[PDB]
Amino acid sequence: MIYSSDLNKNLASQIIEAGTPIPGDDVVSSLKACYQCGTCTGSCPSGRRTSYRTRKVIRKALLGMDDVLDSDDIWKCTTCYTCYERCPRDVK
Amino acid sequence: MIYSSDLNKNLASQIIEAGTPIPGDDVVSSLKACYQCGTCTGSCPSGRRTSYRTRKVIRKALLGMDDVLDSDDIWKCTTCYTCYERCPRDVKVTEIIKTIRNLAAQKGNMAKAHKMTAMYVLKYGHAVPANKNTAELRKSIGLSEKAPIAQFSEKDLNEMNTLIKELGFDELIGFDWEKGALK
Amino acid sequence: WEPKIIGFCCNWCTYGGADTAGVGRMQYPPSIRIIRVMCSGRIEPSLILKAFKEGADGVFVGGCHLGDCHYDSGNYKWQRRVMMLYELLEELGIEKERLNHEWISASEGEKFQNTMKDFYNKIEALGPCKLKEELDK
Amino acid sequence: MKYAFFLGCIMPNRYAGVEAATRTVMEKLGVELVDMTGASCCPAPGVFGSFDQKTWLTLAARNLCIAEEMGVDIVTVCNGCYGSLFEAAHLLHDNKEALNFVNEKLDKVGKEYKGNVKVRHFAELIYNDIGVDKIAEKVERPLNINVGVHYGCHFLKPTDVKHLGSAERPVMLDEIVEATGAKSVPYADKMMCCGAGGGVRARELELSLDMTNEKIENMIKAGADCTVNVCPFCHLQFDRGQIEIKEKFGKEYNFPVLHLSQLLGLAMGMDPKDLALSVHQISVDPLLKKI
Amino acid sequence: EEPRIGVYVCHCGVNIGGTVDCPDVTEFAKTLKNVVVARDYKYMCADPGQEMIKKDIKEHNLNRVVVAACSPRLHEPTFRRCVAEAGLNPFLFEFANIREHCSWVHMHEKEKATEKAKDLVRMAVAKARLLEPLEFIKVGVTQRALVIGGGVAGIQTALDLGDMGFETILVEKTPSVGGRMAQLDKTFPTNDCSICILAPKMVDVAKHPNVKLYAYSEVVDVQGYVGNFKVKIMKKARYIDETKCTGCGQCSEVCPIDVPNEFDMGIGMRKAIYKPFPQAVPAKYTIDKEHCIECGLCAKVCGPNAIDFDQEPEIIEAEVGTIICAIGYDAFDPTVREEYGYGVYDNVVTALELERMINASGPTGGKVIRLSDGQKPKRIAFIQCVGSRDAKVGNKYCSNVCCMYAMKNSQLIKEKSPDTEIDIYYMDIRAFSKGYEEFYERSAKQYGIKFMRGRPSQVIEDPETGNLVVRAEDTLLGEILEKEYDLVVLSVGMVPTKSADEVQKILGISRTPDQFFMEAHPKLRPVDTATDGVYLAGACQGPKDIPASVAQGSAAASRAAIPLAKGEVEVEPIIASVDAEICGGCGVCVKQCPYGAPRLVEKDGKVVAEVISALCKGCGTCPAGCPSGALEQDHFKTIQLFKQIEGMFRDT
Amino acid sequence: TFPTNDCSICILAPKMVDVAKHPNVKLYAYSEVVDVQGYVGNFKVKIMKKARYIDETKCTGCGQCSEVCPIDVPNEFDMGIGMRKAIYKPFPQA
Numbered sequence A: 001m002i003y004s005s006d007l008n009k010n011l012a013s014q015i016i017e018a019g020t021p022i023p024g025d026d027v028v029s030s031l032k033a034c035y036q037c038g039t040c041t042g043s044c045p046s047g048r049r050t051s052y053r054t055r056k057v058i059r060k061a062l063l064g065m066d067d068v069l070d071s072d073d074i075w076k077c078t079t080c081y082t083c084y085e086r087c088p089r090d091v092k
Numbered sequence B: 001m002i003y004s005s006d007l008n009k010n011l012a013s014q015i016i017e018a019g020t021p022i023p024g025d026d027v028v029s030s031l032k033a034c035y036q037c038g039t040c041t042g043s044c045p046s047g048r049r050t051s052y053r054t055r056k057v058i059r060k061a062l063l064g065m066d067d068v069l070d071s072d073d074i075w076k077c078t079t080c081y082t083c084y085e086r087c088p089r090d091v092k093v094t095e096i097i098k099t100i101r102n103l104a105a106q107k108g109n110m111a112k113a114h115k116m117t118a119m120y121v122l123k124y125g126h127a128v129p130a131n132k133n134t135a136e137l138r139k140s141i142g143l144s145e146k147a148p149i150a151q152f153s154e155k156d157l158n159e160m161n162t163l164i165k166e167l168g169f170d171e172l173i174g175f176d177w178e179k180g181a182l183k
Numbered sequence C: 001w002e003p004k005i006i007g008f009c010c011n012w013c014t015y016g017g018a019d020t021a022g023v024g025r026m027q028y029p030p031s032i033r034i035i036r037v038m039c040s041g042r043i044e045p046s047l048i049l050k051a052f053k054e055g056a057d058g059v060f061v062g063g064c065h066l067g068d069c070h071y072d073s074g075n076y077k078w079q080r081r082v083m084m085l086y087e088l089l090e091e092l093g094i095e096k097e098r099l100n101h102e103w104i105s106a107s108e109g110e111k112f113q114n115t116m117k118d119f120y121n122k123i124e125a126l127g128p129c130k131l132k133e134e135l136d137k
Numbered sequence D: 001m002k003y004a005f006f007l008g009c010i011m012p013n014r015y016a017g018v019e020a021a022t023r024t025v026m027e028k029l030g031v032e033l034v035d036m037t038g039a040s041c042c043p044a045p046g047v048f049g050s051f052d053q054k055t056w057l058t059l060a061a062r063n064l065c066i067a068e069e070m071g072v073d074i075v076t077v078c079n080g081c082y083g084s085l086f087e088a089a090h091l092l093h094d095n096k097e098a099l100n101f102v103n104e105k106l107d108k109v110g111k112e113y114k115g116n117v118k119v120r121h122f123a124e125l126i127y128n129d130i131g132v133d134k135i136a137e138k139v140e141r142p143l144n145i146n147v148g149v150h151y152g153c154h155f156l157k158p159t160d161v162k163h164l165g166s167a168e169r170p171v172m173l174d175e176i177v178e179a180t181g182a183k184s185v186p187y188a189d190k191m192m193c194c195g196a197g198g199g200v201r202a203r204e205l206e207l208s209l210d211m212t213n214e215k216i217e218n219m220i221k222a223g224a225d226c227t228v229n230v231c232p233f234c235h236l237q238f239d240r241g242q243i244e245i246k247e248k249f250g251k252e253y254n255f256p257v258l259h260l261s262q263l264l265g266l267a268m269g270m271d272p273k274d275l276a277l278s279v280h281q282i283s284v285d286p287l288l289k290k291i
Numbered sequence E: 001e002e003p004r005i006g007v008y009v010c011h012c013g014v015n016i017g018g019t020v021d022c023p024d025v026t027e028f029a030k031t032l033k034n035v036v037v038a039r040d041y042k043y044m045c046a047d048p049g050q051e052m053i054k055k056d057i058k059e060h061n062l063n064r065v066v067v068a069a070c071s072p073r074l075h076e077p078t079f080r081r082c083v084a085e086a087g088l089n090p091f092l093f094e095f096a097n098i099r100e101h102c103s104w105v106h107m108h109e110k111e112k113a114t115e116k117a118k119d120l121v122r123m124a125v126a127k128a129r130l131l132e133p134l135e136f137i138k139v140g141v142t143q144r145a146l147v148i149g150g151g152v153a154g155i156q157t158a159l160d161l162g163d164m165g166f167e168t169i170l171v172e173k174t175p176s177v178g179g180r181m182a183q184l185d186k187t188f189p190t191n192d193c194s195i196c197i198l199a200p201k202m203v204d205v206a207k208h209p210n211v212k213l214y215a216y217s218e219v220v221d222v223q224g225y226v227g228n229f230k231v232k233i234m235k236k237a238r239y240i241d242e243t244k245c246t247g248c249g250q251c252s253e254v255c256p257i258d259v260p261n262e263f264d265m266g267i268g269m270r271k272a273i274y275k276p277f278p279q280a281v282p283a284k285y286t287i288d289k290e291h292c293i294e295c296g297l298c299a300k301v302c303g304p305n306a307i308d309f310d311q312e313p314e315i316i317e318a319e320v321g322t323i324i325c326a327i328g329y330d331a332f333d334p335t336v337r338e339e340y341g342y343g344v345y346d347n348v349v350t351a352l353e354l355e356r357m358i359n360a361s362g363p364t365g366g367k368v369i370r371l372s373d374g375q376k377p378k379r380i381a382f383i384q385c386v387g388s389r390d391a392k393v394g395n396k397y398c399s400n401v402c403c404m405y406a407m408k409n410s411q412l413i414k415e416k417s418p419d420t421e422i423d424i425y426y427m428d429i430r431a432f433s434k435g436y437e438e439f440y441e442r443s444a445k446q447y448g449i450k451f452m453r454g455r456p457s458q459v460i461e462d463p464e465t466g467n468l469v470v471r472a473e474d475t476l477l478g479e480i481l482e483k484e485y486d487l488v489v490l491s492v493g494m495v496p497t498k499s500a501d502e503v504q505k506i507l508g509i510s511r512t513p514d515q516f517f518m519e520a521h522p523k524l525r526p527v528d529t530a531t532d533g534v535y536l537a538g539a540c541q542g543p544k545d546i547p548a549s550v551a552q553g554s555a556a557a558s559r560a561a562i563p564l565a566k567g568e569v570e571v572e573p574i575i576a577s578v579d580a581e582i583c584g585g586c587g588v589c590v591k592q593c594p595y596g597a598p599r600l601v602e603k604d605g606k607v608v609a610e611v612i613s614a615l616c617k618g619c620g621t622c623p624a625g626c627p628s629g630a631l632e633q634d635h636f637k638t639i640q641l642f643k644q645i646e647g648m649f650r651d652t
Numbered sequence F: 001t002f003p004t005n006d007c008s009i010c011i012l013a014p015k016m017v018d019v020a021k022h023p024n025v026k027l028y029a030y031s032e033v034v035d036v037q038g039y040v041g042n043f044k045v046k047i048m049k050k051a052r053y054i055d056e057t058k059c060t061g062c063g064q065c066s067e068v069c070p071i072d073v074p075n076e077f078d079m080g081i082g083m084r085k086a087i088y089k090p091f092p093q094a
């Protein structure tokens, strides 16, 4: 049960401001282009041995689930850039 | 990581045949119409306080995950029929859950409390039988001390025992007739 | 034994209904054989009685919904004709149920499929109509 | 009106006051209740239907056969028994393969269901065949109190076979309780399940109690003096469940629980002793003071 | 002459062949009397198939052809042209439907389907033997078209036809043309102003030298056939002098009767005397007698004295050659989906109501506000597929435009109020055409519109605030959401317009399972109807957007211009005629014909009946009712049908 | 072809047939427009009628030639999944 009171609506905007000007407004605002296809999760080497699902991080960011910032899952990404290379929506 | 080797292509077909002829082939085959909208999960009162997600049961059934028969989640549905009433694809959800539970029971996934309830109907013809207190209460209220029910009718109790044996329900629950208890 | 059912369907809404069942791959029993007419108004007692004479176990008739006849009122005449025909068949010892008439739009493929399913079951349950065997004596 | 009165399990063997209450209330409305001798558990549709559908229908048909042999239709005051016998009757009329299977089993006990039995719920029977006007005409003691109306799930659903109108926004029970001089208070998630159905009370007790508690909290917030149901299972869950909620959650409410027949009985001037409110786990005395 | 029949069994790839043993049907066909040739082929309508039939007619001197294939409703004309090209009269051709009526419905019963195909071939061969050569009736085409419905589709059809030089009549039910597009604020995917781009076309149509616009009028009767339709138009009484009407609007202030404004979807309130919208064409007022009390207060204020209650509707008789039906659609009524609370909760609205709320010329002055307190909503939820893709309400189809208009209006709300949070509850985002996927990408990246994949279970109102809660599962997380909103918008689907029932009965057209009008063939003829000279354009044929409707309007104009340009069409001689030597003038046939074709007359000193060939549409009711057998419908004679009945059981 | 599951040929072939023998339509198959000059109502167009190396008016379209040709070319119509001959007809219903 996720209620509006458990959500932080400005989390996406907050992630974008933290990314402006480095790595860039256009770079981090790309999360808003995500259409939850799953290509990132399917390409994740870390996701194959853990509960980590790349697509859910972006979903939580758009939905406003603050717990993503407290999660150990975001720290399981090795920065292999495979998802970055395959995303059909140009999400960085 | 779910590989083709961990899946059972026939699960949907096996669920559909268990549902034939009761509640019906057309009734249970309705699971194939599911388009995973989530209306069933959103309407589930049980889902609001547990990890139970009605839509996933149907998904697992279509994908071929046999673990759905071993799950405690399918047993958290109260048969409130809300999902059944709201499904835009005419999936007879509540009936599919009950049918999946039949296969779960056949695999040995039946709770002891449920087996006990079933044992009372087999033993006394009733899930909630009359007690010494029942007789005394009924007497003081002005009702017949013993209600005109199967509990006090050997003819009717024996009729039920014949049907139970013919349906193999006694073997399903694991009831021993000479010991008069579950194995 | 499989029932022999003859059908009479008007070319507009009904023919369209039966066609739509096919487009939608709506399976139904293969007993019926449909005869096409332009309107159900073309249907009269002699065509139905001729079918039983030939050995029909069941006879089906389908026309447009009352008020939706492509020819305005053809089905209203057929409706008066079929009601007398149901009673005439009982007088002749032919079960009323061996005759079935329904109103089907081009948009009702599911209704046609179910009407065919229900009619087939009805005739199968009644068994063969023994008129031809009685006449061939 | 003459009807074979199916009793079920919980009403005749536990909350017997509901039986007594029904017999007089129905007699006052002009309904001849005849004994359905040897009738067994319906059986519980959610519990048994989940174990083996074939066993649920065969045993239900066996009960339907008792009333068929009597040449009369059935009446029940339990949603559980209503749902089980009603759905069984519909399935046997609509599905010949199911009917054939069941009659092949019933032949072993010398029985055969022929589809002439109609199953009725007393609340809809009162609403569609008797009339709500007749309830008010027989009110000796008007009950001017607030009621948290609990319809239950198996009363109106599944609508595709019940045909008792809307399951989302019904008026049927509200109009019957209001005829006694009471007020059906609107509360949050009114049409939600009590939590006992489908064998959940027995196998997952704390989960059932969580739903019952939500319903009681909502009714109390709406200003209800009690809760009225049309189901001994709901009755037990609301009544006995409160003791369990107190022992498992630490929450006490002492919220009176009544079955519609008991509420209609009070309204028709019955002795509260004959309604057996003393066996109720939660005292009805606070409500009795309010009337 | 003796029948020499050619039987052709089509496989239609594997559509027939995969279920019916076509080679076996072909062998069986040869065992029937008069069947001198029998062949099976993969595609009978294809060039080699048609050339095969044609070559055989000449080489094997056939006088009857039987094609055992698809439905005659699809290719009967195709094969009639094929045989006529070889010299065989087209009425000596007989279709046997073994696809839609056999192979497609008996897929799991191949042996019985094969047996059924044999009987259908035999039934066809049985009727074929007694068929007769008939002369197609060449009829002239009145150089005039009739367009019913004044929306973007109908306007497009009349403009193209008028631009081609064809006299066209455009009948519009309401007081103004423009349709639902006139009610919209902007249009996706360009976000153009809807009326700002539609008005120029409404103006063009109103002053087109070849188009006669009849606004506030309805077609009440259509008689005849292709090229010779006689149409009756009822020019409804506005009860205001049309010519003396300035369109200033000063008589409405006095009116004491408030009527809900249909144009504003029931939000706004108009008077008995009113105007549909500010950019209305023609610009004139109307008195609604359904709510007028005849107090005459409006007349006291009215200067010109244009108000006249003694005004009478005028019935206009017009002759047209072709008819285009473009009556559009209506928005689904979501009250039935009781869990969403429409009609119960004040802040639950339909998307069409929202369009009127957003539109500058609307009741709220282009301000999106809550109907409970008049406050602007800070949080909004759009619920997709309301009244569509839903078996419980009987609409198992996709309404096509809801995903797009929901994203569009979300962008317009963000432009007007960027701080507004918008969530769209969906199953599939259908942004399927040019610039649509791009529009979808834009809504999220540029406007920050959020999407939740999950069809909501229910909406719950807080009686204290009027706020709504949407219960739904975020299927992409496997969790239940219970988010609060200030306004809930239901993306209602499209349903046929209320008058569709009347228009269907007048034109004699059919409907598809979705209740919209039925096209001749979904791909072979998307705007033609099975009724010759009657075409469709726009949403009345099925849910679709503006360009698709404009394209259909243009398509219908082309199809409808073919008979007009030819000036001559061929019609079926399957008409009734009386054998004077048998008719004793009993008079039973006369009143059976709804067109009054059979009439009693004096011949050779006594009374006999005589059918007026031109008035007979070929139903076969009067011959069926004739007790002497004097009346017979060519191509459906009792003897022909008798042989067809025998054919099911034996060869005759 | 969806959603009727009709054969493509069902709808397309009769139309191909009609167009080839239409009295008001001049079909130039195996041809390309190589130049267009002018403006609306006054266009001057150049069509290149490519060489088939067969006399169309004399050709029967029997295909006895296809059986004898010894060179195999990948069939474009079959997307390279078929092998045609140097002398050919794109597909049987062409």
Ligand SMILES: Cc1cc2nc3c(=O)[nH]c(=O)nc-3n(C[C@H](O)[C@H](O)[C@H](O)COP(=O)(O)OP(=O)(O)OC[C@H]3O[C@@H](n4cnc5c(N)ncnc54)[C@H](O)[C@@H]3O)c2cc1C
Binding pocket: E148, E149, E150, E151, E152, E153, E154, E171, E172, E173, E174, E176, E177, E178, E179, E180, E181, E184, E186, E187, E188, E189, E217, E218, E219, E326, E327, E328, E329, E331, E351, E352, E355, E401, E405, E408, E497, E499, E500, E503, E537, E538, E539, E540, E544, E545, E546, E547, E549
């Ligand atoms: C909420 C909503 C938003 C939309 N947004 C967009 C968008 O942004 N972009 C887009 O391209 N499309 C949009 N659409 C779809 C668009 O509305 C339709 O494509 C368009 O209205 C179709 O035009 P039409 O002429 O076919 O039907 P209509 O516009 O409905 O016109 C039919 C006309 O015929 C008249 N009529 C009806 N019955 C009769 C009769 N019996 N006799 C004579 N006349 C009659 C009517 O009064 C009406 O004027 C939207 C639809 C909805 C519901």
Ligand code: SF4
Binding pocket: A033, A034, A035, A036, A037, A038, A039, A040, A041, A054, A055, A058, A083, A086, A087, A088, A089, A090, A091
């Ligand atoms: S691959 Fe891109 S669009 Fe797809 S879920 Fe991942 S970030 Fe979103």
Ligand code: SF4
Binding pocket: A040, A043, A044, A045, A046, A047, A054, A076, A077, A078, A079, A080, A081, A082, A083, A084
């Ligand atoms: S960059 Fe990170 S999230 Fe992306 S595929 Fe690699 S490990 Fe996974």
Ligand code: SF4
Binding pocket: B033, B034, B035, B036, B037, B038, B039, B040, B041, B054, B055, B058, B083, B086, B087, B088, B089, B090, B091, B093
């Ligand atoms: S509501 Fe129906 S279609 Fe939707 S996910 Fe549940 S079973 Fe499937």
Ligand code: SF4
Binding pocket: B040, B043, B044, B045, B046, B047, B054, B076, B077, B078, B079, B080, B081, B082, B083, B084, B093, B094, B097
């Ligand atoms: S029937 Fe079961 S799964 Fe469906 S809403 Fe009720 S408790 Fe949930």
Ligand code: SF4
Binding pocket: E240, E244, E245, E246, E247, E248, E249, E250, E251, E252, E285, E301, E302, E303, E304, E305, E306, E307
């Ligand atoms: S009726 Fe008279 S006052 Fe009213 S708008 Fe017309 S001209 Fe003006």
Ligand code: SF4
Binding pocket: E254, E255, E256, E257, E271, E272, E273, E287, E291, E292, E293, E294, E295, E296, E297, E298, E299
């Ligand atoms: S006569 Fe009719 S239109 Fe005029 S003011 Fe009175 S109610 Fe209004």
Ligand code: SF4
Binding pocket: E384, E385, E386, E388, E389, E397, E398, E399, E400, E401, E402, E403, E404, E428, E429, E430, E491, E493
């Ligand atoms: S266009 Fe979109 S919202 Fe509309 S019916 Fe289709 S999927 Fe549903």
Ligand code: SF4
Binding pocket: E578, E582, E583, E584, E585, E586, E587, E588, E589, E590, E608, E609, E625, E626, E627, E628, E629, E630, E631
């Ligand atoms: S029904 Fe027949 S017999 Fe009678 S008048 Fe007409 S054509 Fe002549």
Ligand code: SF4
Binding pocket: C071, E575, E576, E592, E593, E594, E595, E596, E597, E598, E611, E615, E616, E617, E618, E619, E620, E621, E622, E623, E633
């Ligand atoms: S067949 Fe007779 S009833 Fe029918 S249209 Fe012709 S003249 Fe009229």
Ligand code: SF4
Binding pocket: E010, E011, E012, E013, E042, E043, E044, E045, E046, E069, E070, E071, E075, E099, F007, F009, F010, F011
């Ligand atoms: S359209 Fe008809 S004739 Fe053509 S291939 Fe299909 S079934 Fe055969």
Ligand code: SF4
Binding pocket: F054, F058, F059, F060, F061, F062, F063, F064, F065, F066
């Ligand atoms: S198909 Fe080949 S062999 Fe036959 S006529 Fe044409 S070129 Fe000659």
Ligand code: FES
Binding pocket: C010, C011, C012, C013, C014, C038, C039, C040, C041, C063, C064, C068, C069, C070, C071, C072, C074, C075
């Ligand atoms: S046309 Fe269908 S019944 Fe007259």
Ligand SMILES: [Fe+3]
Binding pocket: E196
């Ligand atoms: Fe403008």
